[PDB]
């Protein structure tokens, strides 16, 4: 044939993720749209370098609800700064339901497909997102020819061949009907990594400050006293231990959320803080004068 009908693994930068997410969530509940600017290379790579949002609508995303006068005006700026790049797909946020596509969004999808042969749709649902990465997938049109003549899974070949689900129920429904989903990847250069992270100027101040001592008499006093109540129960657990079954041990003497595990945990965690506190205090006095 004349095609290879394969979907790209989508590389989304640092620069693009935050813009997509910030606009989706401030704007939610209300479906919102905007284009994605990038670079196309290969047939298995598509870059989402930058993005810009396009104005709100309460009629959801349609081809009759977009502002083309706005798109034009932006591309005119884009040329005067010398940053012009080609449109590589489009992004939208659904307002409250998982990544899937409705009919209205297939109509919007179809025309980006015509404009640029390969293009992606990245769909951000920012209120089922909690790791900044979950419930964000890319999608791409499946042709009607692809279903009936089995030219749909040529995108499972010459790639990793894995698809990682965020919503099992929601993806699987549109996976045969009207889209094929392929997994998303993230990227940055090393200049970006350092910027994204930052180094704090208060990182050095909080190192060299020993906290108030009123809060420290309280800390030691409270902690050492609390470990007496559970120290006693640690004996009663192990009165017998030669009895079979781990759940059994916990049911006889009420060792549920074990007194060995809790008491130890308390011993390690107050211990970590006290060593660091005597360290900070001794550092400041010897250092400064």
């Amino acid at each position: 044939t004349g095609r290879d009908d394969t979907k790209e693994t989508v590389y989304i930068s640092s620069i693009a993720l935050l813009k997509m997410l910030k606009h989706g969530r401030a704007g939610v509940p209300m479906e919102v749209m905007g284009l994605m600017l990038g670079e196309f290379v290969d047939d298995y790579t598509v870059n989402v370098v930058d993005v810009f949002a396009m104005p709100q609508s309460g009629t959801g995303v349609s081809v009759e609800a977009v502002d083309d006068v706005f798109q034009a005006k932006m591309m005119d700026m884009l040329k005067q700064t010398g940053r012009d790049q080609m449109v590589v797909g489009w992004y939208h946020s659904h307002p409250g339901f998982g990544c899937w596509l409705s009919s209205v969004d297939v109509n919007t999808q179809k025309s980006f497909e015509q404009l640029n042969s390969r293009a992606v749709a990245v769909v951000v649902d920012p209120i089922q997102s909690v790791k900044g990465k979950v419930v964000i997938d890319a999608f791409r049109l499946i042709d009607t020819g692809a279903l009936i003549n089995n030219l749909e899974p040529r995108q499972t070949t010459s790639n990793t061949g894995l698809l990682n689900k965020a919503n099992i129920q929601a993806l699987i429904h549109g996976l045969n009907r009207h889209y094929y989903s392929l997994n998303i990847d993230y990227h940055k250069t090393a200049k970006e990594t350092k910027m994204l992270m930052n180094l704090h100027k208060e990182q050095w101040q909080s190192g060299l400050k020993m906290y108030d001592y009123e809060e420290k008499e309280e800390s030691n006093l409270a902690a050492t006293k609390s470990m007496v109540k559970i120290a006693e129960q640690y004996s009663k657990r192990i009165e017998e231990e030669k009895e079979l079954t781990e759940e059994e041990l916990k049911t006889r003497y009420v060792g549920r959320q074990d007194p060995k595990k809790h008491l130890s945990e308390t011993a390690d965690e107050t211990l970590e803080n006290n060593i660091v506190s005597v360290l900070t205090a001794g550092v400041n006095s010897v250092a400064i004068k």
Partner: protein, 96 residues
Amino acid sequence: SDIYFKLKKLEKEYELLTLQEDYIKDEQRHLKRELKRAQEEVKRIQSVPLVIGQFLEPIDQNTGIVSSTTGMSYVVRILSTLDRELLKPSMSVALH
């Protein structure tokens, strides 16, 4: 002596065991940092927003039955290192 010249090659082999022994300490450190990271996610879920139910009865001891003020009724999984002794009496509970 024959054993002794065969040894030379054995001693190199024991040296890779030495390097396994140095390698454990490097794996250990990675896991310990990460156990605290794994735990941080679960604290996000413990805290706000929450939606208030009323705890009915345990049906297991790791999975319960609740009701909500949402207008519905669910089966929910009980997260660990929390009290299972204070779900016996029906009392208000919070679900994520």
